[PDB]
Nucleic acid binder design. Structure first.
Ligand SMILES: NC[C@@H]1O[C@H](O[C@H]2[C@@H](O)[C@H](O[C@@H]3[C@@H](O)[C@H](N)C[C@H](N)[C@H]3O[C@H]3O[C@H](CO)[C@@H](O)[C@H](O)[C@H]3N)O[C@@H]2CO)[C@H](N)[C@@H](O)[C@@H]1O
Ligand SMILES: [K+]
Ligand SMILES: [K+]
Ligand SMILES: [K+]
Ligand SMILES: [Mg+2]
Ligand SMILES: [Mg+2]
Ligand SMILES: [Mg+2]
Ligand SMILES: [Mg+2]
Ligand SMILES: [Mg+2]
Ligand SMILES: [Mg+2]
Ligand SMILES: [Mg+2]
Ligand SMILES: [Mg+2]
Ligand SMILES: [Mg+2]
Ligand SMILES: [Mg+2]
Ligand SMILES: [Mg+2]
Ligand SMILES: [Mg+2]
Ligand SMILES: [Mg+2]
Ligand SMILES: [Mg+2]
Ligand SMILES: [Mg+2]
Ligand SMILES: [Mg+2]
Ligand SMILES: [Mg+2]
Ligand SMILES: [Mg+2]
Ligand SMILES: [Mg+2]
Ligand SMILES: [Mg+2]
Ligand SMILES: [Mg+2]
Ligand SMILES: [Mg+2]
Ligand SMILES: [Mg+2]
Ligand SMILES: [Mg+2]
Ligand SMILES: [Mg+2]
Ligand code: NA
Ligand code: NA
Ligand SMILES: [Zn+2]
Ligand SMILES: [Zn+2]
Lengths: 33, 85, 96, 143, 104, 52, 115, 89
RNA sequence: CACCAUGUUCAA
RNA sequence: ACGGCCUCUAGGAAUGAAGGAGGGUAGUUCGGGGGAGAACGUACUGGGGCGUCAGAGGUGAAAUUCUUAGACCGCACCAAGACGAACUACAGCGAAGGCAUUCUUCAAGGAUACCUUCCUCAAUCAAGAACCAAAGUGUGGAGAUCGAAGAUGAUUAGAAACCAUUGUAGUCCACACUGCAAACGAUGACACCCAUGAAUUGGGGAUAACUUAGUAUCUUUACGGGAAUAUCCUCAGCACGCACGCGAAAGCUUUGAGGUUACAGUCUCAGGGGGGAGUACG
């Protein structure tokens, strides 16, 4: 390892999970309006 | 024991090695020379770091060639350093 | 270094000499014998160019074949219009 | 050149002498030095070139030390000063040449970057000359 | 966490250059910057001592007066392969500054 | 046969004297691949990509 | 002279001088281009006015090689200069007489003879 | 004052035919209706008079080139190649 | 260089 | 140099040129800096030509795979697209991103040199502007290699992973977008001071606090009064081991992270316990 404790999942994959979540939310609002 | 360097009056050896603008009082490195043309046989004053085309009045032959630093005098010509002042 | 020098002489002529712009005025100077130099753009029509060279040959007037077109020749003279032919009638301090 | 626009830290420059008196071997009169300055100017030479030729081939290290006047001052007094200041003229010429090259070479992004620096330098220089009234108001470099 | 090496494990000072084109590791093919990869120029004999003796005996060309050809190879390894192949080993902290400028 | 290899041509005669049958539509051209003097033939790249 | 076209592929190496103390002997680029031009001029001059037979003799006997290094050392101190590869890239139309003139007296072959 | 934000000349089509087909057509439409430099006579006076046909209002020369521009980049490459091969011969 | 996964909650 | 008639005659009185900035000239310097064009180089793959015959490939071991309809291998070629090995360095260039065959070209750029010019024109910067690796997007090309997705074969309790054989989008080019990097020296820009040894790149110069304290080597009929070394000096650049001092320490050290509670050279950006979160809304 080259980093300290993440205290969570790997930050790159957490960022991707957030990115997919943002895409889903903006799609749901689009279908609503 | 040896002589301690004085900042206000540096020694000859210390001052001579310094860059012209790093001396205690800045000054030129260049000078002027009397050059006798090998073809015109005439005296012309030439800058030691001439970058332009210096030619003899008579022969119209180039008296020197520009370089990165000091100008190079053509073969045959005789040069004499003129006094700085 | 084909254009840089002649542009400098053109600037000196433009400042301290006497010149004429256009084929018709240039031909008039050649007929009068007052022309000292004729400059021709590279996009001059072949029949017009040949007429100018023939006039210059008869009058023994030097010709310079400019490396630019009429737009470049006008700009080199400091004008905002094109010129096919330039005739210098007084060289001024240019030495051209 | 050195420091503005490009983090160069070069120090090359002239080092003017402390003693300003013309050397004793220089027998040329001040009125003749003025004549050569005007004569060189009429041949189209810029003030920078005029000084270098006098320095290289006439033994005149400093026109000001010989005549009391700078070369540009002599030209201004004789009505031979350039319409555009020398440094502005050369910067404008470089910008025009670079634009001429870029007209064909549209992917020379380094030249485009250097052109931005040159034109920025021109506009700052123009601002100074208009302030000191060496340029007419409403002078504007046009790309 | 902590800066292990002053040069960061490569020969690229901070104001020397931006990017060094990477090379493929000699063993695994991993792309590593050329200034970082462990470089070794190896001059290997084509044959070991016993086989070279037998071939030289059968050769009218090769013998005491004419040497056999060798293999010349520039081998650049990624850090992992260099360590795993023992071309280079982890060293004590005080010994990490020891550099060699010629093959010993 | 008089045109150098690598040149870009159009209005190409498929047969000598046919007065132009190949590379005629707008923006099209043929590329001269090579000359073979032994058989007196010329190889071309037609606009479609085929060699003829 | 007989219409053979060849490519020459010369390679040279810089060397330190006898009293040199520097850690490298890298060459100035302007000298490298000067070395390239002199090599190109010499090779073209020497090989363009001779036949393929004489050209091969020059190459295989190193006459051109010694000429190149002798005249190129004053430009740049060279550890060694050599022609690493020569390849014929274009041959003229076949000529039986020229081939026979190249081979001179042909040694007989006994392969087809009875044992 | 500016009458359209981005449509430009394509505003004659209203809301029809789609944004991307309009944008792609616009680039070629502006080119085909624009004035182009004439190497003869040194003027910006070349206008299209049919697909592939260009006439200069200045010198009245007619030149065959380009469906929507005076000269195509392929023609520029071909011009240099022919000049180079001509010198080589 | 086949394949080695896991260890309940506090507190000694 | 001396003398002499006539004509013209506001014309020399302005601090200085910053070891601040901008220009100029020069070697026609220096460099994997940038753009354009023409060529070269083997290699990967493929194709026939010419030979051979039973395997080849791949792995920890295998299988997917190829193969008497001739694979693999051998020789010389041809085609196409990439790439520029060794040399390649605690080396160079560039504002950063980045940049490596040769030749011919087009504009630049820094450094050095100068008794050239000039005269405060500067430093740093909200707003605004241009550029910006890879991946990704659009339209045309191109498509050899590698290869997200996918397919097959292994491994495994499972393995839709790592390994093997493949393979789409891509990878390459033109034009137009995107402006998300550990875009790092995790270290803002300008300026000043600062001890020591050995190197390196580029350009020049020389061979009672003291009045001046050397030195060569090799090549040498045309990019040649040349080229490189040697000793010394110098300015500019990337750095190394090395005294203060500093720091929580690791470490930094004229290349500061030093010159700071003995706290003030100038400007500017960001931070105020950890999460929620660079999320929600606009
Ligand atoms: N180049 C000529 C100049 O025109 C000047 O006059 C111009 C200005 O007074 C004024 O120009 C303004 C300018 O003040 C202001 N700072 C910027 C503005 N864009 C200019 O406006 C000008 O340019 C825009 C497009 O560029 C045109 O749409 C507009 O019609 C035109 N007036 O309008 C005139 C333009 O025709 C002055 N006469 C003088 O500076 C000089 O002669
Ligand atoms: K390393
Ligand atoms: K980093
Ligand atoms: K450097
Ligand atoms: Mg670890
Ligand atoms: Mg952290
Ligand atoms: Mg003293
Ligand atoms: Mg700056
Ligand atoms: Mg660690
Ligand atoms: Mg590293
Ligand atoms: Mg740098
Ligand atoms: Mg980077
Ligand atoms: Mg033997
Ligand atoms: Mg060196
Ligand atoms: Mg436990
Ligand atoms: Mg100054
Ligand atoms: Mg085969
Ligand atoms: Mg190479
Ligand atoms: Mg600033
Ligand atoms: Mg990309
Ligand atoms: Mg389509
Ligand atoms: Mg594959
Ligand atoms: Mg970011
Ligand atoms: Mg930095
Ligand atoms: Mg950061
Ligand atoms: Mg350098
Ligand atoms: Mg240090
Ligand atoms: Mg403070
Ligand atoms: Mg907080
Ligand atoms: Na093959
Ligand atoms: Na076969
Ligand atoms: Zn590896
Ligand atoms: Zn026209």
């Amino acid at each position: 390892g080259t980093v300290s404790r993440p205290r969570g999942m790997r930050p790159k994959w957490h960022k991707k999970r957030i990115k997919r979540l943002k895409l889903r939310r903006r799609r749901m609002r689009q279908r609503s309006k | 024991g040896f002589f301690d360097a004085d900042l206000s009056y540096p020694t000859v050896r210390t001052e001579r090695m310094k860059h012209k603008r790093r001396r205690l009082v800045q000054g030129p490195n260049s000078y002027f020379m009397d050059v006798s043309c090998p073809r015109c046989r005439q005296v012309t004053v030439v800058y030691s770091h001439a970058t332009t085309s210096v030619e003899c009045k008579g022969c119209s032959k180039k008296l020197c060639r520009p370089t990165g630093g000091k100008a190079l005098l053509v073969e045959g010509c005789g040069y004499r350093r003129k006094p700085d002042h | 270094s084909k254009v840089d020098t002649i542009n400098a002489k053109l600037q000196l002529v433009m400042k301290s000499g006497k010149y004429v712009l256009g084929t018709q005025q240039a031909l008039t100077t050649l007929r009068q014998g007052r022309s000292k130099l004729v400059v021709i753009a590279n996009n001059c029509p072949p029949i017009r160019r040949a007429e100018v060279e023939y006039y210059c040959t008869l009058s023994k007037t030097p010709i310079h074949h400019y490396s630019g077109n009429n737009l470049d020749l006008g700009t080199a003279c400091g004008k905002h219009f094109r010129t096919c032919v330039l005739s210098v009638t007084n060289v001024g301090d240019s030495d051209i | 050149m050195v420091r503005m626009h490009g983090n160069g830290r070069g120090k090359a420059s002239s080092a003017l002498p402390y003693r300003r008196t013309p050397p004793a071997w220089l027998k040329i009169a001040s009125r003749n030095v003025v004549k050569m300055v005007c004569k060189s100017s009429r041949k189209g030479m810029m003030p920078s070139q005029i000084g270098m030729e006098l320095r290289d081939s006439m033994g005149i290290a400093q026109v000001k030390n010989v005549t009391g006047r700078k070369i540009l001052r002599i030209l201004k007094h004789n009505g031979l000063a350039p319409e555009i200041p020398e440094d502005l003229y050369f910067l404008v010429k470089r910008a025009t040449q670079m634009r001429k090259h870029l007209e064909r070479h549209t992917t020379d992004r380094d030249t485009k970057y250097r052109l931005i620096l040159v034109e920025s330098r021109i506009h700052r220089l123009a601002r100074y000359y208009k302030r000191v009234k060496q340029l007419p108001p409403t002078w504007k470099y046009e790309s | 966490m902590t800066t292990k090496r002053r040069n960061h494990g490569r020969s690229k000072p901070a104001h020397s250059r931006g990017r060094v084109k990477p090379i493929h590791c000699f063993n695994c093919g991993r792309l590593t910057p050329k200034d970082k990869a462990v470089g070794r120029f190896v001059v290997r004999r084509m044959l070991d001592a016993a086989s070279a003796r037998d071939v030289a005996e059968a050769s009218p060309v090769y013998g005491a007066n004419f040497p056999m050809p060798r293999l010349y190879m520039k081998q650049r390894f990624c850090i992992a392969c260099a360590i795993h192949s023992r071309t280079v080993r982890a060293r004590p902290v005080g010994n990490r500054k020891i550099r060699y400028t010629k093959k010993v | 046969g008089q045109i150098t290899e690598g040149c870009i041509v159009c209005n190409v005669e498929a047969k000598p004297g046919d007065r132009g049958t190949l590379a005629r539509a707008s923006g099209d051209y043929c590329i001269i691949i090579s000359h073979n003097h032994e058989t007196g033939r010329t190889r071309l790249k037609l606009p479609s990509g085929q060699k003829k | 002279a007989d219409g053979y076209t060849m490519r020459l592929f010369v390679v040279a190496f810089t060397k330190p001088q006898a009293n040199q103390q520097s850690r490298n002997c890298y060459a100035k680029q302007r000298l490298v281009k000067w070395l390239r031009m002199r090599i190109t001029k010499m090779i073209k001059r020497r090989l363009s006015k001779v036949q393929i037979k004489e050209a091969v003799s020059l190459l295989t006997r190193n006459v051109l090689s010694d000429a190149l290094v002798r005249r190129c050392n004053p430009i740049l101190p060279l550890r060694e200069l050599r022609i690493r590869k020569v390849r014929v890239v274009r041959t003229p139309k076949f000529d039986a007489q020229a081939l026979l003139s190249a081979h001179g007296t042909i040694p007989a072959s006994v392969e087809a003879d009875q044992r | 004052a500016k009458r359209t934000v981005k449509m430009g000349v394509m505003g004659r089509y209203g809301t029809r035919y789609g944004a991307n087909p309009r944008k792609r057509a616009k680039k070629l439409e502006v080119s085909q209706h624009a004035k182009h430099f004439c190497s003869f006579c040194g003027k910006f006076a070349f206008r299209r008079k049919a697909v592939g046909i260009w006439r200069c209002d200045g010198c009245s020369k007619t030149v065959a080139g380009g469906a929507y521009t005076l000269s195509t980049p392929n023609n520029s490459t071909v011009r240099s190649t022919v000049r180079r091969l001509r010198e080589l011969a």
